[PDB]
């Protein structure tokens, strides 16, 4: 019903950002959202160096929601992520992971066509819409929106996508949610600098929880939770989330931190989100069939 | 079962001058019997990690010598079968694994094997996954300690290989000289706290030798994908090598260009971290294997 319009969007997550809406804590609201360059790539033989870079990585925001607090957290639901008919990538030599390795610049757009992203005649890649950068305003300095922190920002975690719930924390009081970057597809790493990058409408039920449970920004699916950090490196970023997910487990838990530690290192999984923004991120992930297990909810 | 290893025959170094115990054709079963990563020597709960000879952890079985297998070859190695004892070993050691700085106290505990089950505790269990963690061949330089991943294989600790897998090792002196060991009866991706559940068994393999290296080894196809292994002093580099290593095998090897297939991958592809604890860091890029049909590969 409350509806947030991508005319009315930010390049930073800050807290001295007006916010554009507000709601009630249990709302349903929907974000209209540009594609991470603004949408001013529009055909395959438009270079990346061409666009305004000050208009890169536009989220939808900030909302207002009503009863949060500082030391709160948000529980957002993700009901529905619906995308645009084409989306964009980018190659660019000295970009990504494979920056040394790229030869020339290439643009390429993908038409999506029902379930199916087109990559060309004979590859048609499975539509998995998400979210890669979605976040609250940090209590101090404003972060650009190209960036991932404890407030979460830009993230490029493939599991934030429908039926997924994020937990954020609230550092100001209305946390000032915003989002926006979504992709039609994207595999774990984000490896090239993009998925494919594409402008959409976002549908999500956002809840305010008085009680901070576990460390930031953390996530939900159908089967398992997972916690997730973001630092200069991948080393880092993997022992952070690795130990977010151990010291939650061994505080709310009956397990000591040695058998937390033996359950994660027999049962769970560190992934990657992307190697290649400015920070990068991780996500340590075990089944919610053991929590329940160990009596927590 | 064609040709059978005792784990009486056991090296802790991958090296060119170990002699072979044992000699096989290509397309022959071999049978690897192996102890435990700590030569079976905690058999108790309160034995400390501290109190074991550490030049007696990490033996392999072998070394094989494939006949016909000659420098510039590589192994093709189906795993047919892998069969664990009856109980697991883990340690939480102060100091070691991801969770290093946040443990209190040396631990040690036994995983009951029953059914298909790994026995937590009364109320939680695991699934049975039968891999194997130490699986490589000779290096054609200096040796190296079994604990150490490389191109050669080694400490890999990749959980995908398992039952149905194939593994791809390079020969870099003639015969190969393949060894392995370090069974786990479960483990997560990232070996967080540096261990899976060890245990000892058997592990029934093909053996093929392929005379063109058409990909960057180590190497795996599942099932469903296909994975390219790489281990580096930093997360952040194995992860960086990994992802080349397809990105540079699928331009090489199909019409793609190298940024055609830097997209794919970003796309369709996901990076995974297979462990984390190792003196090097191992991760893999996996693609499915229904692109390597549609590129003809
Ligand atoms: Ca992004
Ligand atoms: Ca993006
Ligand atoms: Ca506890
Ligand atoms: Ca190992
Ligand atoms: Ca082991």
Same mark, same amino acid.
């Given at each position: 019903?409350?509806?947030? !319009? ?18 009630? !804590?249990?709302?349903?609201?929907? =974000?209209?959202?540009?594609?991470? =360059? ?26 207002? *929601? ?16 619906? *995308?645009? +008919?084409?989306? *964009? ?24 066509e029902?379930?199916d992203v087109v990559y !060309?005649?004979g590859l048609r890649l ?6 890669? @950068? ?26 934030? +996508?429908?039926?997924?719930? @994020? ?40 809840? @305010? ?29 993997? @022992? ?31 992934? *990657? ?6 920070? +990068? ?17």
């Amino acid at each position: 019903m409350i509806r947030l !319009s991508n005319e009315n969007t930010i390049f930073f997550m800050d807290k001295e950002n007006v916010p554009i809406a507000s709601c009630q !804590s249990g709302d349903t609201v929907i =974000f209209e959202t540009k594609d991470c =360059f603004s949408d001013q790539i529009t055909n395959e033989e438009q270079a990346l160096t061409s666009i305004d870079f000050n208009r890169v990585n536009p989220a939808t925001g900030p909302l207002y *929601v009503e009863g949060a607090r500082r030391g709160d957290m948000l529980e957002i639901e993700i009901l529905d992520i619906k *995308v645009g +008919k084409q989306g *964009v990538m980018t190659a660019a030599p000295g970009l990504g992971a494979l920056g040394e390795s790229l030869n020339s610049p290439t643009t390429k757009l993908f038409p999506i066509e029902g379930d199916d992203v087109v990559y !060309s005649t004979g590859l048609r890649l499975p539509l998995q819409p998400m979210i890669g @950068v979605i976040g609250t305003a940090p209590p101090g300095e404003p972060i650009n929106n190209g960036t991932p922190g404890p407030h979460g920002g830009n993230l490029d975690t493939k599991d934030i +996508k429908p039926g997924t719930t @994020v937990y954020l924390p609230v550092e100001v009081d209305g946390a000032l949610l915003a989002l926006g970057d979504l992709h039609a597809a994207m595999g774990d790493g984000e490896i090239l600098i993009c998925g494919v990058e594409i402008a959409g409408t976002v549908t999500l039920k956002v809840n @305010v929880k008085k009680e901070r449970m576990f460390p930031l920004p953390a996530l939900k699916t159908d089967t398992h939770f997972m916690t997730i950090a973001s630092a200069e490196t991948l080393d880092a970023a993997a @022992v952070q989330a690795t130990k977010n997910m151990a010291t939650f487990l061994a505080n709310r838990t009956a397990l000591s931190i040695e058998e937390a530690g033996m359950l994660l290192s027999g049962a769970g999984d560190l992934y *990657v989100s992307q190697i290649v923004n400015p920070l +990068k991120t991780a996500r340590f992930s075990l089944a919610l069939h053991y929590f329940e297990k160990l009596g927590v909810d």
